[PDB]
Design a binder for these strands. Structure first.
Lengths: 449, 449, 447, 449
DNA sequence: AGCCCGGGAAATCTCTGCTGCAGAA
DNA sequence: CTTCTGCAGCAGAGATTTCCCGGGCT
C-alpha cells in the first residue's frame, strides 16, 4: 500500500531556487508544503511518501544512512551547514565563505580541539574523506557512486514584523569537491593550534531557471534504483560533467551577473532600418577623420549623461595626436543644488567596422586610467564583445557603454533639435568645430574649470 | 620729457593674476598695452615710462643687468622660463616639475651636455647661486637683496579663433628657493651622462586679491632706492619673508583650492530663521538616537541625488548594531536604461550640535572604504572643519557633504512635500518602520538589486 | 635485529608545539618523564643502540655519519634563548613565526672569539649545511641534513611553576636566506660580527608535525642517501627535487586571527625594551617631528629587514600634523627598469596605555593610490576596531606598535650608537627641516 | 725632496669623475700624468712625489698593503676590478651586475671551485669580510676607519680612429656594502658546483660633483693622520654616512635622471647570446599552450622577487581553459617578521616572438583590475612597446616588466642553481602542472594561505 | 666676439579634402 | 537603366622643419 505513496511522491514536483529562504524547525511535519509562512525543508528533502527517516541538517556536514541500490550500495547525499550566526563572517581565517555569483565555495571541517583523534575521526570529516576519495579516481562508476553536496547557510529573516534568528536556512546550490587540503587552525581559548580538513567546492549551473527541483534526492535514497539510474532528474550540468569529466567544470560552474547583458542585435538598430544606414553613413564619414568622430562622441556622451538627469560639462579633448588611452574629457556633478561632488569623466572614442567588435583590453586601457572617483565612457560604432561586458560588470568597472543604436537615437534627437544644414551639416559641424580647443592638461585640472 | 611718460606710469595698477594670457613678440613696442587681443609682456615689465630697455625672456634662467646702489651691488631680478620642447615636459629630460596648488616648483639649471665642466659655465647657474645665497640667507639684509624669481610657462589657449604655439606665455607668479642641489641627467640622443643644477622653489601668494603689482620691478631696478623703499609694491608675503627667516616658509606658502571653502556659519542656516529652529529641534530629538538619524540621512541622501532627476536606487541598512565604516548604501545608474551603470554610494551620519564641526579623521574613515567608481556621503547637523574640507578638495576625495543647513532644508522639504503634517509623524514613521535592518549583505551586491 | 624491526613496527610522530621533558638524567628506554615526553627518547630510540644527542643552548649537532656512497652530516638541533629572565638582553634575537612557517635565527659569535664568522665547528657545519641546502643537484639536497627547531618555555603545569628542563617542538625548517650582520653586546662590551639566518618551516601535509622515523633512518649507516627518505614530509621531498623554487610555496601555514591585543603589542615589563619605550614616550611627548624622523628611520630598517630596497624620500611638513608625516619609496623590478612603490607614513607619540583610533590611520589609508602602501608608527598600541577594520577591508598598511618600535630602535642604536641612546636621539633631534620638503607623494618616483 | 710635490698635491684639487675612461698599464710609472691622451691610473692613485709604493690592480678583488694610523692600524682602500671576460659570450649567471641609474651594484667574491674549505679561503673574500665588518660596523670611530671600496670596470673605448676593448678601465664610484649572502655557483659548460659569497652594495654620491676627490684619498692614505681631520675635501655624502651610519644609506644612493623607457633592443639579450635560441624554442614550444607558459612565468616572477631576498609565496592559476583576463596570482609580504602586510600580485603572460613588442592595451588589461595597494607583473619573451612603457610612467602604473634579457637571465640562473642544467625536465614540469595548480579562488583569498 | 629650455617667415611636411570618369552590385 | 564605387606624382590649410634673424648682456 506504501508503493502508491512512493509513486505519488516520485511524480510530484518540488522546486527550490538558489538563494531562497527555507524553514527549518525541530519536529514538525514533512507532509506540509508550507510551515510558518515558509517552505518546509524536510518536505522538500523527504516528503514522507517513501516512509523514510528525515534528512537531518545539523552542525558541520550530515549524511543519511547507506542506501543499498539493486546494483550496489550508494551514499545518498551530503547536506552541509554553514553558520554565520549573525553575519559574523569574515573577521577570521576560519573563514567559511560562499560566492554564489561566480560559483565558488570554501568550507571547513567540523574538527575541534576537543577531539583527541586525528582529523577524519569525526563523522563529518570522515564522510568528507569518503567523498574526496570518490571524487578522485580512475573508474567512471565511482563518480556515480560519489554523493552530491548540497549547500545550506544559516540566515536571519527579520520578516513578517517579527525579528528572529536561526531556524532558517538558505540553499546555495549543489557542489562538487575540487580540493581537499589539511590546514591548521587556532583555538584562542586554549591558545592551541589544531589540524582540520579544508574543502574547496564548486557550484554547478542550475540551468535557465537557476533554481533546481529535486526528485532525484529520493532516487539517491531509493533502494530499488541503481547508481546510474539516479541521474534522471539530475541537472544537465552534473550529468554532462559525468560524461566529460573535471575538464567541464569551468563550463558548468554557476554564473550570476549583477546586470543583464545585451546581444549584438539588440544594441544596433534594425538591419532594414534607415537608422542603421545612417550609422553606416557615419562609418563612411568618420573613417578618415577620427578627430571629428571624437568630438561627436563627446556631444553624444554629453547627451546621454544629460538624459540620465545628471549635470554634465565637457572639459575638452585630451589629444588630437599621439594616440593614448584618452580621447576627451568632461565632468559629472553628483547631487542637487548646494549639495554636490565633482566626478572626472574620461571620454573615449573608437571607430571600427560593425562586423568586428571592441576587445576587452581596449576598454580596460581606459579603465586603467581611472582613479578613485572617476568614471569612464566608451563610444563605438559597432558593438561590445562578451568578454568586455564580463570584465566590466563582474569586476565592477564604472564604464558607460555607447553602442550603435544609442548614438543613432542621440543623433536622431540632435538633428531635429538643430536641423540647420540637414543631418549632414551636423557631421560637418563635427569637422568644422573639430579643433574644439586642446589641452596637455591632466584630468584633475577639469575641476577648476 | 624724462618724467612726462614716467610719472603717469608710476602710479598705474600693474596688478597681474596667474593664468592670464601674455604676449611675447619680437619687435614689440613698450608703449602699447595690448597686442592682438592680449596684454604685451614687454609693456607689462617696463611700459616706456621708465625708458629702461625691455626685459627679454630668454635662455631658460634669465636676468637683467646687475644693479649697483650706494652699497651692496645687487641683481635686480631673475626671469625664469620653462617651455615645452614641445614634449619636453613629461616626455623628455628637463621637464621642470610644476605644482601650483602646493606652490612647489622644481626647476633645472642651465648646464648642458654640450657644456663641459661642473655646473656651471653658463650665466644661468651663476645667477642661480648668486640669488640662492641671498634667498637662503639667515640675515634679513640678504633677504632684502634677494632677487625675485618671476616664473613663466608657455601655454596654448587664446580666445576663440585658433590655438597658439609661439609668442604666447603665461605668468606663473613669483617663487622663493626652497632648496638647491646638484643632479645628474642623461641624454637619450647621445647616451652620455652630464651634470646639472636642480632646485626646489616655493611660490608665494598675493592674498585674497591674489594680484602681483608689477611696479615692484621699478624700485627693483632703481639704483637710487635700496631695500627700504623696494618693498612698497611687493606682496605682504614677500615682506614677511624679508622680515623673518626660512622658518616661516610653510606659513607664507601659497595654497589655493579648486573649490570653495564653506564657513561654519555658511553651512548652517541663517540665524533667526525657521529652518534654524527646525534644525535645533532635530538635534534636540536625535541627540540620543543614532540609528533613526542614520535612516533619516539615508532618506535625505536618497532624493538629494534624485532632485536633479538623476537615476537613483535606495539600498539597505548594514546592521542593527556593531555599525560599519559607512552606515547606509545607495546606487546610481548612469545613462539610458540597459546602458545604465551602477555607482556605489556609501553614506554615514553623525548627530552633533550645529556649533560643532566634523573632524577630518572620521571623514577619512568614510572615504577609506571607497573603491573603484565609489562615492561617499557624510550627513551631520553640524558643520565641517576647514582642514577636512581642504583635505577633500586638494586630494580630490569623492564625497558629498551634508551640513545642518542642507539637512534641515531637505528635511523640511521632505516633510511638506510628502506629509505636510508635523515632523513628529515622519520621525515616528521612521523609527517604527525602520532603524531595524531586514537585509545584511555586502555593498557590492547593490548593483545586482 | 629484532629490536630495530620492533621500533620500525610502531609509528613515531610529534606535532609542532609539543612540550618535551629535557633531562640529562633519566634514560633512553623510557617514553615519558614527569608528565612530559622525553627528548632523549624522542631523538634516540631504544631499538638502535646509538648514543643520546644532547641539546645545549644555541646550535648543536652530532658528528658526520659514514655512508656507502659518501659521508652524511647528522641533523641540526637548535635551542632557544631564555627570553629573557635576565640572561639575555640583546636586541638581535630569535624571531619565531610558526603561523607562516617563517623563523629567523641568529648564530653564535662572541667577541672573545678571534677570527672570521663561521670558524666554530657548529658554525662550520652550519655553513656547510647551508651549502648543501642551497645545492644545485637533487643529490646535494637529499644529502642536506634536516633542521629541527626547539624553543624554551615559560608556562604553568598542574597548578605549579613551569618549567625547569622543558622545551617545545617548533618543527623542521629549510635553509632559505642567509645574511651577514654586525651586532653589539653591552655586557661584552665589545662589538662583534654575527650571522643571520632566515629559515622556512615546512608543512607536514596531512599531519601537523613530522615523522620521527626519518631521522632514525637517516642516522643509520646502511641507509642509502637516495632511499633514506621514506617517512619524510612531502614538502621536504618535493623541495629536494624542485630546489629553491619550492621554498616559497611549501611553507607551513596556520590559519589564525592576525589581531594582536593591546597587551601583545606591548613588550614585556622585564624585557628592558619597555623602559626604552617609556623614555621615548617622555622624550617625544613635546617634540613630534623628531619622532616622525625616528619613525621614518625605523620603518626604513623594517622594510630592509626582509632584504627589500627602501629609499627615503622626505618628510611632509614640520608645521602641524596631517594625513602624511613622512614619505619613502621601495623599488622592485628588473633593476634595468625598477617598479617603484610609494610609501606614505604617519607617526604619533602617545601613552603606551592609549589605543590608536581607526580614523587616524584611515587618514593615511585615504591617501593611498594604486600600488602605494601606508606606514603607521605609534608609541602606544592599536585599537581592536582599527585592526579588524584594516584586516577585513584589506588595507595595505603596516602597523608599528610600541614593541616593534622599541625593538627596532634598540637594534638601530646597538648597531650604530651602541652604548649611547642619547647619540641616536641626538641624531633624531639635530635635523628637523633637513629632510623636510614640500612635494607630492608621486614625485618620489624620480628620486 | 718629495715634500714640495706633496704640498703641490695638497694645494691643487685632484678629481676623478664617474664615467671617465682611464688608461691602466702594469708596466707604467707614477710620473706621467696622462698616457695616450687618457689620464693615468697610477698617477691618480699615488703621485711619484708622494713616496708611496706602487699599488697593483688586477681582475677581481685587489687590496693594497695595510696602513697604521697614529690612533690605530687602518685599511686605506679596496680596489675592485670587474670584467665579464665575456667578449659577449658570457654564460655565467652569477656574473656581477651594475645599475648606476638607481645606484645599486651586485658584486661577487673571488672564491674558486678548486679553492677548498668554507668560504672564504681566498684573500679577496676574507679582506672583504673585514671590509664588510667595518662597513656595517658600530659607533662613529669604526665608521671613520672603515675602508672605502672603489669599483673599476673594463670598458670599450675609442682612440684616434681606433678602438680596443682591453687596456682601459672605468670609475664606477665609491660604494658601501649593504648586505652579504651565501650562494652556490655552477659552471655552465661543465657541470659542477662551488660555494661563494654574493654582495649587494650601493654607490654613494659625489656631492657637488659626480665622482671622487683623490686629494682626500691621499689624506686617508697618509700614515700619520688624525681621526676626523683626515677628510676635508671628502664628499659630503660619505661624511653624512659617517655621522648617521646605515640610517643614511637609502639617502646617499647614487641617482641618475633618465627615461625609464626601454627599447626592443635594450630589453632583449645580445646578438651573440646563446639564450636567444632557447627563447626561440620557448616560443615554438609554448606556441600551442599558453597557460603552461603562464605557470612558467609565475615561477619566473617568483624567482625574480626571490632574487631580492624578499618574502614571496607561490600562487595559483585561474583557468587553464580557453582564455581569460588574469593569467596567474601571487602575494608579497612587505615588512619585518613580527610586522608585515600582504599585497596581491596580478601576473599576466602571453607568448609572443622576441622581435614583437607588447601593445599598451594588453598590459592595461592587467592594470585595470589592480586595486589599492595592489601590484602586477607582465612576463613575456618579446619586449614592450614604447607607448606602453610611456603609459606606465605617465599614469604611475605599479607593474614589473619581465622581457628579453632579464627573463633569460633569471631562468638560466634558476636552471643552474635548482634543476642543474636540465631545462627539459623544467619544460615538462610546466607542461604537467598547468592543470594541477588551477584554483577558482578569489585574488583576495591568497591572504589565507 | 660670442651665446641662448627664443620668434618670425619661408622653406616642405602631413593627411583628408573630391570631382568626373569609368564600370559594377 | 540605376546609383554608387573604383580610378588619378589632384588641392591645400594646418602643422612641422630650416633657417634667418633676434634681444641683452660679460
Amino acid at each position: 500500500i506504501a508503493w502508491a505513496a512512493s509513486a505519488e511522491v516520485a511524480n510530484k514536483p518540488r522546486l527550490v531556487f538558489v538563494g531562497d529562504e527555507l524553514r527549518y524547525a525541530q519536529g514538525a511535519n514533512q507532509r506540509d508544503v508550507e510551515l510558518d509562512g515558509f517552505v518546509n525543508y524536510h518536505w522538500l528533502t523527504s516528503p514522507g511518501g517513501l516512509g523514510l527517516p528525515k534528512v537531518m541538517l545539523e552542525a558541520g556536514i550530515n549524511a543519511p544512512a547507506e542506501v543499498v541500490g539493486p546494483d550496489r550500495s550508494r551514499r545518498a547525499l551530503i547536506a552541509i551547514r554553514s553558520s554565520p550566526w549573525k553575519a559574523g563572517h569574515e573577521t577570521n581565517p576560519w573563514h567559511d565563505e560562499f560566492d554564489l555569483d561566480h560559483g565558488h565555495v570554501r568550507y571547513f571541517g567540523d574538527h575541534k580541539p576537543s577531539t583527541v583523534g586525528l582529523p577524519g575521526e569525526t563523522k563529518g570529516n570522515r564522510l568528507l574523506l569518503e567523498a574526496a576519495r570518490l571524487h578522485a579516481g580512475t573508474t567512471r562508476e565511482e563518480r556515480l557512486l560519489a554523493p552530491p553536496l548540497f549547500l545550506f547557510r544559516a540566515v536571519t529573516v527579520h520578516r513578517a514584523g517579527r525579528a528572529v534568528v536561526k531556524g532558517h536556512v538558505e540553499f546555495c546550490g549543489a557542489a562538487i569537491i575540487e580540493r581537499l587540503e589539511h590546514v591548521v587552525q587556532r583555538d584562542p581559548e586554549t591558545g592551541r593550534s589544531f589540524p582540520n580538513l579544508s574543502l574547496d567546492l564548486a557550484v554547478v549551473s542550475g540551468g535557465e531557471i537557476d533554481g533546481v527541483d529535486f526528485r532525484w534526492i529520493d532516487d539517491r535514497r531509493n533502494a530499488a534504483l541503481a547508481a546510474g539510474e539516479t541521474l534522471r532528474h539530475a541537472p544537465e550540468s552534473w550529468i554532462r560533467w559525468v560524461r566529460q569529466g573535471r575538464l567541464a567544470i569551468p563550463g558548468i560552474r554557476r554564473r550570476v551577473l549583477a546586470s543583464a547583458v545585451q546581444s549584438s542585435k539588440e544594441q544596433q538598430p534594425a538591419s532594414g532600418s534607415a537608422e542603421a544606414a545612417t550609422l553606416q553613413t557615419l562609418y563612411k564619414f568618420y573613417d578618415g577623420r577620427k578627430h571629428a568622430f571624437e568630438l561627436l562622441a563627446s556631444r553624444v556622451a554629453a547627451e546621454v549623461f544629460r538624459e540620465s538627469g545628471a549635470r554634465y560639462k565637457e572639459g575638452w579633448l585630451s589629444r588630437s595626436s599621439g594616440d593614448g588611452g584618452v580621447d576627451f574629457i568632461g565632468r559629472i556633478d553628483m547631487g542637487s543644488l548646494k549639495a554636490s561632488t565633482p566626478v572626472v569623466v574620461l571620454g573615449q572614442a573608437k571607430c571600427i567596422q560593425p562586423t568586428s567588435s571592441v576587445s576587452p583590453e581596449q576598454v580596460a586601457r581606459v579603465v586603467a586610467r581611472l582613479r578613485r572617483g572617476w568614471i569612464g565612457v566608451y563610444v563605438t560604432t559597432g558593438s561590445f564583445s562578451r568578454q568586455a561586458q564580463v570584465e566590466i560588470i563582474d569586476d565592477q568597472y564604472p564604464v558607460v557603454l555607447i553602442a550603435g543604436g544609442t548614438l543613432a537615437a542621440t543623433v536622431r534627437r540632435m538633428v531635429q533639435a538643430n536641423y540647420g544644414g540637414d543631418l549632414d551639416a551636423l557631421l560637418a559641424s563635427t569637422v568644422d568645430e573639430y579643433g574644439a580647443a586642446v589641452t596637455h592638461r591632466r584630468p584633475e585640472e577639469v575641476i577648476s574649470l
